[PDB]
């Protein structure tokens, strides 16, 4: 069976560079082997097929090279559609058989984080329930820190936290910080606040509100 | 139009099995191949097997355990994978793809998103959410909605029907107590909002659901 190295497994690249992936095939494939771009919960997409023939709808962006065990994925000039994963598959030998896949990063301008609050709807009170959610979006680097504050005292229990990966929108990252209580608990406080620490600023963004 | 269709998710009991279906839309041949393509959780692309469904002859992987028998059925032109005896090491999207006879996959399947577990469905809560009055814009504005308590896995979120797609995030699922939980975050000009309305989508295809909810300002 057909062994398919894909190295690096993660690739770095400033905006308008030229990339090229790697793909080491364990023995000679000929001219046999496919590229596959896949995108965030999303579904794989041919870019290039046998070796360096181009797809159309595909842009001339994209190209390929290589034969028998080497072979070269190139994207001239990177941009921010092209941050996905990167898979190669041959077709030389049965079974057909997948790379390991390599991850497209950009090094893009430092970008401070938009930090939004919103209060716990009036349909979720009902419910007796009571979620207050923080958003800090399109920042750069993706290291960030968030802080809750409840009244001026800070507050961790009840937080759930998650990251989006790098946007294929803007080579940004963006980060969703959710905190959860009971109606009874929300509704004998007064200040929310939301904390956001990141290296564009040595001041942090602060979103909050009352809930009278 | 969308060449193969593959339902969004499906939920099965430890040790149960399911049948994954395919159909397919588009030129149809003799010659056309139906790949299966398994792919966990923040993995890559594994190879299943494959079918021809002109004879009804399939081809398993030998290096992985045996979890599917494949068939077709011709006079709905539809595809069948049947994953037996399933446990955790199971859960995971599997893709549906056509191949031409030439090697490579020309076309992908939307996916099969199947988890395993013991759990029961359980569909989400969607609350809107809208800036409090006394929060300050500049030339954007953002709005977003909450997508709480659901089970299992996944769950579709569109902005005004899928005409709002840029300036979208959705932010991964959080699970606690066989619960999952997620946010979607939109951002438009300020001065569009609310005079223009602003609604998001959730689908859920576990529970067959979909709902929309609009973003108005706190009165």
């Known amino acids: 069976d057909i062994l398919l190295t894909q190295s690096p497994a993660i690739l770095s690249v400033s905006p308008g560079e030229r990339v090229s992936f790697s793909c080491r095939a364990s023995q000679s494939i000929g001219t046999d082997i496919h590229w596959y771009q896949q995108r965030t919960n999303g579904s794989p997409r041919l870019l290039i097929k046998?070796?360096?023939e181009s797809i159309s709808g595909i842009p001339s962006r994209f190209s390929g090279s290589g034969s028998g065990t080497d072979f070269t994925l190139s994207i001239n000039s990177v941009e921010s559609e092209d941050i996905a994963n990167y898979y190669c598959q041959q077709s030389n030998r049965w079974p057909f058989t997948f790379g390991s896949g390599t991850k497209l990063e950009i090094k893009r301008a430092d970008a401070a984080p938009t930090v939004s609050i919103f209060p716990p709807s009036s349909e979720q009170l009902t419910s007796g329930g009571a979620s207050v959610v923080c958003f800090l979006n399109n920042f750069y680097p993706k290291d960030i820190n968030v802080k809750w504050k409840i009244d001026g005292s800070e507050r961790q229990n009840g937080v759930l936290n998650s990251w989006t990966d790098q946007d294929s929108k803007d080579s940004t990252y963006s980060m969703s910080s959710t905190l959860t209580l009971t109606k009874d608990e929300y509704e004998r406080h007064n200040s929310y606040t939301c904390e956001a620490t990141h290296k564009t600023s040595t001041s942090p963004i602060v979103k909050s509100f009352n809930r009278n | 139009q969308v060449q193969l269709q593959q339902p969004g998710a499906e939920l099965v009991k430890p040790g149960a099995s399911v049948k994954l279906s395919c159909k397919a839309s588009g030129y149809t041949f003799t010659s056309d191949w139906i790949h299966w393509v398994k792919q966990r959780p923040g993995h890559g692309l594994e190879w299943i097997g494959e079918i021809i469904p002109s004879y009804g002859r399939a081809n398993y992987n030998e290096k992985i355990q045996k979890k599917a028998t494949l068939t077709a059925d011709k006079s709905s032109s539809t595809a069948f994978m049947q994953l037996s005896s399933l446990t955790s090491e199971d859960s995971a999207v599997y893709y549906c793809?056509?191949?031409?006879?030439?090697?490579?996959?020309?076309?992908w399947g939307a996916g099969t998103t199947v988890t395993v577990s013991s759990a029961k469905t359980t569909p989400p809560s969607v609350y809107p959410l809208a800036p409090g009055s006394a929060a300050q814009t500049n030339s954007m504005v953002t709005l977003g909605c909450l997508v709480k308590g659901y089970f299992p896995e996944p769950v579709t979120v569109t902005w005004n029907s899928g005409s709002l797609s840029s300036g979208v995030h959705t932010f991964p699922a959080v699970l606690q107590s066989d619960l999952y939980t997620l946010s979607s975050s939109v951002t438009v000009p300020s001065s569009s909002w609310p005079s223009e309305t602003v609604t998001c989508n959730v689908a859920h295809p576990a529970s067959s659901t979909k709902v929309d909810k609009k973003i108005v300002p706190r009165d």
């Open positions: 793809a056509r191949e031409r006879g030439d090697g490579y996959f020309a076309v």
């Open positions: 046998y070796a360096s």
